[PDB]
Design an enzyme around this catalytic site. Structure first.
Site, PDB file in Angstrom:
ATOM      1  N   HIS A  15      39.092  45.471  41.079  1.00  0.00           N
ATOM      2  CA  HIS A  15      39.102  44.636  39.881  1.00  0.00           C
ATOM      3  C   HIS A  15      39.328  45.489  38.643  1.00  0.00           C
ATOM      4  O   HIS A  15      38.710  46.544  38.489  1.00  0.00           O
ATOM      5  CB  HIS A  15      37.780  43.883  39.722  1.00  0.00           C
ATOM      6  CG  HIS A  15      37.712  43.038  38.494  1.00  0.00           C
ATOM      7  ND1 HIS A  15      38.693  42.129  38.162  1.00  0.00           N
ATOM      8  CD2 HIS A  15      36.781  42.966  37.514  1.00  0.00           C
ATOM      9  CE1 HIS A  15      38.368  41.532  37.029  1.00  0.00           C
ATOM     10  NE2 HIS A  15      37.210  42.017  36.618  1.00  0.00           N
ATOM     11  N   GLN A  33      40.613  34.773  32.942  1.00  0.00           N
ATOM     12  CA  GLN A  33      41.818  34.761  33.768  1.00  0.00           C
ATOM     13  C   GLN A  33      41.859  33.566  34.714  1.00  0.00           C
ATOM     14  O   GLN A  33      42.938  33.226  35.216  1.00  0.00           O
ATOM     15  CB  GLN A  33      41.923  36.057  34.574  1.00  0.00           C
ATOM     16  CG  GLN A  33      40.818  36.226  35.614  1.00  0.00           C
ATOM     17  CD  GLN A  33      40.813  37.589  36.256  1.00  0.00           C
ATOM     18  OE1 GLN A  33      40.327  38.557  35.684  1.00  0.00           O
ATOM     19  NE2 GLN A  33      41.365  37.675  37.452  1.00  0.00           N
ATOM     20  N   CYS A  77      43.687  40.234  36.411  1.00  0.00           N
ATOM     21  CA  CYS A  77      42.822  41.208  35.750  1.00  0.00           C
ATOM     22  C   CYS A  77      43.621  42.403  35.259  1.00  0.00           C
ATOM     23  O   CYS A  77      43.404  42.900  34.150  1.00  0.00           O
ATOM     24  CB  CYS A  77      41.742  41.669  36.722  1.00  0.00           C
ATOM     25  SG  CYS A  77      42.417  42.180  38.332  1.00  0.00           S
ATOM     26  N   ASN A  98      35.376  42.440  30.282  1.00  0.00           N
ATOM     27  CA  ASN A  98      35.892  41.737  31.439  1.00  0.00           C
ATOM     28  C   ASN A  98      36.816  40.602  31.000  1.00  0.00           C
ATOM     29  O   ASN A  98      36.913  40.259  29.818  1.00  0.00           O
ATOM     30  CB  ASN A  98      34.739  41.218  32.292  1.00  0.00           C
ATOM     31  CG  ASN A  98      35.131  41.039  33.741  1.00  0.00           C
ATOM     32  OD1 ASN A  98      36.314  40.991  34.066  1.00  0.00           O
ATOM     33  ND2 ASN A  98      34.141  40.940  34.622  1.00  0.00           N
TER      34      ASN A  98
END
Ligand SMILES: *[C@@H]1O[C@H](CO)[C@@H](O[C@@H]2O[C@H](CO)[C@@H](O)[C@H](O)[C@H]2NC(C)=O)[C@H](O)[C@H]1NC(C)=O
Ligand SMILES: *[C@@H]1O[C@H](CO)[C@@H](O[C@@H]2O[C@H](CO)[C@@H](O)[C@H](O)[C@H]2NC(C)=O)[C@H](O)[C@H]1NC(C)=O
Lengths: 215, 115, 216, 114
Positions: free
Chosen positions: C163, C20, C26, C183
């Site tokens: 997150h 990102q 996120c 992630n």
């Protein structure tokens, strides 16, 4: 449940195709129903492979005929169905060539339309999408169909013999009708399509064996 | 029970479509015979039809040699041949694909034997 | 009567890790990731969807300045679809909604949220549904410099998450139960972009504090 | 609830913020064309954002110091006396940090006078 509706206008229907000399109307009818539910759930219109169904639906007889209910059972149990592009149509029997990595649609089952109830079909066509249906297409007046809303007193409303796809319903010049897609090429009927009489007492047995898949 | 869609079924040999598929078979048969004499149909042993994009006709027919020649004009009366060496027989299997709205007939599978 | 271990990467449900960058998106990578998995399940094809679609167009979120996943799911429902990564590639910077109508790649019929604090629920959801968008506390250095093993840190704030990641499975490693998470911090973070977070250890890092998935 | 990836206020004493401030000071001097060293007086507002790494948004008051731009005794360097020799400035920084790469990056910065 509106009074007019045409899933071709909404972008749910692939171009008309030709089954040729192969008794595979059930494969085209069921494939087009899956094409409709793929559009509703994804937004992509992707032509699917009736050949996949003709070859691999082992409980049907391929070019010797079959049911649309079994085709859906295949896509469910088999866990997919290829695209027309990855598994093109050849109009003949052959060994199964299902390519799992090229699958383009799945099917979580099917639900049948109650026999004889045209209101139920209308309801199903409105909330679900294009519906696979069986009719008696054996009369010459259906082979030479051109325009208008088809109705013929001699249409056997008890024994049906041909699969097609209801892609909508409406009215024309005063008579309510179904909008059915055939697999006899664009040179048949009205660019491959026809209008069948609606609410004229289950004309040609259109609700005797109608089904749709669940995605 | 309810039959399958697209499956072949037995056919009455007097239909306006079976007769027309038969006359088509005879016409192509005579064109595919070195025999001088024109041949015509004796009986239809079996007639099956199948609904597709058009109709498939599966005809098992008994053919016979007539006394009239391959290229007669008034080919409307053609009796079977009388003498043992004037007459001849054959049992033939034709598969005819008709498309009524295109007006076409097509012979897709063919096979004759003595018978 | 639910599997002890599942890994949706093997099943072909997970796109490759992305980064990102400087943008705080996120939430968009997580939501697009749950939609990717749910498209694979419904149709069979795996197609990377566009997080930039969501960054630019979810006007009820703040683009690169943060957002929610449930909101992203609600956008694609009311907007009537989302474009694919190829049609709408990621740039990691705010811009105007360049959503492209006819390039619909997936649809959404709503969303659902996991019961807060119920890891047993999240386990069933991963098994039944597929990859679940979740929120954790990813602010500690131990998470920033994670590389291998089952991440556990007694200081991980299990009350205030900050997150979004994407759970793609669960299981055990050397006798310690864990969640598998994807992630959005590129492949050089963690274990080729993934991690194993402690599971059934009192909602470690608040993983079930704000978990959701889309409906198709 | 709270939004994910949203910038939030931060304490200037945090390890990550001090490390980001030092980087801003170094880059600030690297492109100033100055005579004496110039460090920060105080941080008046600090925000951090969570991303692929951490973004730091710092507002600091800067001022020219006694020490020269190239001396190595930078530990104890007080500020000049008069405003003429101080050149006070209120600087706003923008620092992209990626800890697992060892990276610090100055994305944006400007300085008005105070
Ligand atoms: C099944 O279908 C897939 C998808 O079309 C085929 O995958 C192809 O694999 C070759 C190399 O083997 C690649 O060059 C092609 O690009 C792939 N296709 C696509 C669309 O990307 C696979 O070969 C097929 N398997 C069969 C027919 O056995
Ligand atoms: C948004 O989508 C439209 C789809 O209608 C794109 O237009 C298509 O562009 C491709 C590229 O050459 C053509 O092959 C298609 O034929 C076009 N569509 C039609 C209906 O003809 C358009 O480019 C997209 N906008 C973007 C990517 O900014």
């Amino acid at each position: 449940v509106p009074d007019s509706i045409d899933y071709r206008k909404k972008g749910y229907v692939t171009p008309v195709k030709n089954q040729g000399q192969c008794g595979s109307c059930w494969a085209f009818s069921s494939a087009g129903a899956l094409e409709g539910q793929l559009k509703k759930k994804t937004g992509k219109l992707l032509a699917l492979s009736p050949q996949n169904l003709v070859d691999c639906v082992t409980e049907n007889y391929g070019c010797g005929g079959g049911y649309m209910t079994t085709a859906f059972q295949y896509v469910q149990q088999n866990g997919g169905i290829d695209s027309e592009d990855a598994y093109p149509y050849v109009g003949q029997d052959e060994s199964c060539m299902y390519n799992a990595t090229a699958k383009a649609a799945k099917c979580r089952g099917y639900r049948e339309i109650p026999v004889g109830n045209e209101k139920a079909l209308k309801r199903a066509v409105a909330r679900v999408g294009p519906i696979s249906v069986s009719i008696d297409a054996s009369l010459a007046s259906f082979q030479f169909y051109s325009r208008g809303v088809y109705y013929d007193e001699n249409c056997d409303r008890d024994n049906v013999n041909h699969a097609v796809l209801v892609v909508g319903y409406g009215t024309q010049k005063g008579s309510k009708h179904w909008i059915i897609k055939n697999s006899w090429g664009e040179s048949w009927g009205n660019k491959g399509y026809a209008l069948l009489a609606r609410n004229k007492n289950n004309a040609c047995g259109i609700t005797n064996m109608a089904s749709f898949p669940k995605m | 029970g309810p039959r399958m869609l697209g499956a072949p079924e037995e056919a009455d040999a007097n239909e306006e479509g079976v007769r027309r598929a038969l006359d088509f078979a005879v016409s192509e048969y005579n064109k595919g015979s070195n025999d001088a004499y024109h041949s015509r149909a004796i009986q239809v042993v079996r007639a099956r039809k199948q609904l597709v994009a058009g109709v498939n006709y599966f005809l098992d027919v008994e053919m016979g040699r007539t006394t009239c020649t391959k290229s007669q004009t008034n080919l409307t009366d053609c009796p079977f041949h009388d003498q043992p060496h004037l007459m001849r027989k054959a049992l033939c299997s034709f598969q005819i694909y008709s498309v009524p709205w295109k007006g076409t007939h097509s012979l897709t599978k063919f096979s004759c034997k003595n018978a």
